[PDB]
Amino acid sequence: PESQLDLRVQELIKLICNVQAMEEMMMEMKYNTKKAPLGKLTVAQIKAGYQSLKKIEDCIRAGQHGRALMEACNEFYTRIPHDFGLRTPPLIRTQKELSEKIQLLEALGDIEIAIKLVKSERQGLEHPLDQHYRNLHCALRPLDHESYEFKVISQYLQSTHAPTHSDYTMTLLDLFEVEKDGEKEAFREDLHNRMLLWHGSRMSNWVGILSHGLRIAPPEAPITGYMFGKGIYFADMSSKSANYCFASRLKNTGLLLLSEVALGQCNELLEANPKAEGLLQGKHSTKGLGKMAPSSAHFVTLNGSTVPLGPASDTGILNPDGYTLNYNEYIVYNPNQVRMRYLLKVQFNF
Numbered sequence: 001p002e003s004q005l006d007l008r009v010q011e012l013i014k015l016i017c018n019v020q021a022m023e024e025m026m027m028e029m030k031y032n033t034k035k036a037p038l039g040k041l042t043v044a045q046i047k048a049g050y051q052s053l054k055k056i057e058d059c060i061r062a063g064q065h066g067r068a069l070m071e072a073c074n075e076f077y078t079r080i081p082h083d084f085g086l087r088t089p090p091l092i093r094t095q096k097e098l099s100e101k102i103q104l105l106e107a108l109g110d111i112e113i114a115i116k117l118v119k120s121e122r123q124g125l126e127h128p129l130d131q132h133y134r135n136l137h138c139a140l141r142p143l144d145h146e147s148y149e150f151k152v153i154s155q156y157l158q159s160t161h162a163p164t165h166s167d168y169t170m171t172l173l174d175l176f177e178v179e180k181d182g183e184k185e186a187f188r189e190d191l192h193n194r195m196l197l198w199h200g201s202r203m204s205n206w207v208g209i210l211s212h213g214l215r216i217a218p219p220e221a222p223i224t225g226y227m228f229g230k231g232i233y234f235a236d237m238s239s240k241s242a243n244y245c246f247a248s249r250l251k252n253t254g255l256l257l258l259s260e261v262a263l264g265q266c267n268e269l270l271e272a273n274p275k276a277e278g279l280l281q282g283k284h285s286t287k288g289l290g291k292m293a294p295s296s297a298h299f300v301t302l303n304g305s306t307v308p309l310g311p312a313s314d315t316g317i318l319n320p321d322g323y324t325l326n327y328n329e330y331i332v333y334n335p336n337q338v339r340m341r342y343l344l345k346v347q348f349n350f
């Protein structure tokens with residue numbers, strides 16, 4: 001039969017459920033899509049991968065950068081097959097190298113969800129796009145370009161583009177209202193400091209993110225791979241999140257998520273600290289302080305959340321003991337402090 005979805009929702013579904021596009025992104029992360037096919041991805045395989053990354057972290061923390069690290073890394077590479085051709089497999093020793101493999105394990109986890117969704121099939125009663133959309137359990141409502149909502153989020157996106165991210169501009173192609181099943185029932189409405197904040201992710205992750213929500217990293221993952229602990233990270237500057245779309249000149253279409261974030265009492269921090277969650281003791285979120293952020297003067301309100309609009313003003317924060325974050329980032333440690341609201345289809349103009 002024919003599809004009953006809006007044509008804009010149809011395009012969105014085709015975009016995020018493109019398994020072959022997921023194949024391409026993984027091959028660009030030096031992952032072996034043939035020896036270990038994304039159709040044969042198991043939660044247990046990804047689980048063992050996280051555990052291998054933890055053993056690597058143990059070696060780095062212990063200074064054991066010889067045999068032990070070599071064998072630890074080889075265990076990760078055996079559980080998570082890589083395709084380096086004739087290159088020798090590289091040792092994982094810095095935090096950034098650790099984070100890179102966490103991102104890969106995250107994308108594999110969200111591809112596992114997406115492949116399971118697309119593979120669940122009916123026959124000739126519903127259009128395939130309609131069944132994928134139903135299986136999402138997340139309503140996606142196309143908003144009108146001339147509508148008022150398009151106007152406010154466009155200014156949010158353009159006016160919070162950071163000036164140090166000058167290699168690209170962004171054009172808003174389409175706007176969707178998001179209502180994931182159950183998120184509104186779980187949301188901590190009692191908490192104050194509710195803001196509409198950004199979250200960017202690779203194109204492979206959206207099916208998993210929309211269907212399961214933004215989630216807390218598993219216990220077996222190495223804690224040092226998360227600069228402010230195992231939580232859910234947002235920015236008030238659109239481009240800082242948009243960097244995490246990992247769009248390229250050739251794949252210059254990505255998605256940006258806007259979410260209501262029940263920040264409550266922020267535990268404000270200057271530098272990173274993977275153990276930041278233990279330092280909350282009563283407070284509800286971590287705020288990493290940046291030298292630049294939208295000013296309280298331009299803040300507005302949308303559906304009960306503070307939209308930190310306006311051009312970014314100089315904040316005045318400076319870390320004397322070390323690196324100073326260029327822009328804010330907020331971290332909550334429970335998904336019930338997050339309600340997804342808007343999905344932006346964004347063209348990156350490099």
Ligand SMILES: O=C(c1cc(Cc2n[nH]c(=O)c3ccccc23)ccc1F)N1CCN(C(=O)C2CC2)CC1
Pocket residue numbers: 106109198199200201213214215216217218226227229230231232233234235240241242244329330
């Ligand atoms: O939000 C994060 C996260 C993101 C990042 C990078 C990031 N990604 N995207 C952003 O918009 C952003 C904004 C400010 C600062 C960081 C970011 C780093 C550590 C993190 F724990 N998550 C970690 C991965 N997520 C998962 O659901 C996996 C399944 C456990 C989603 C929640």
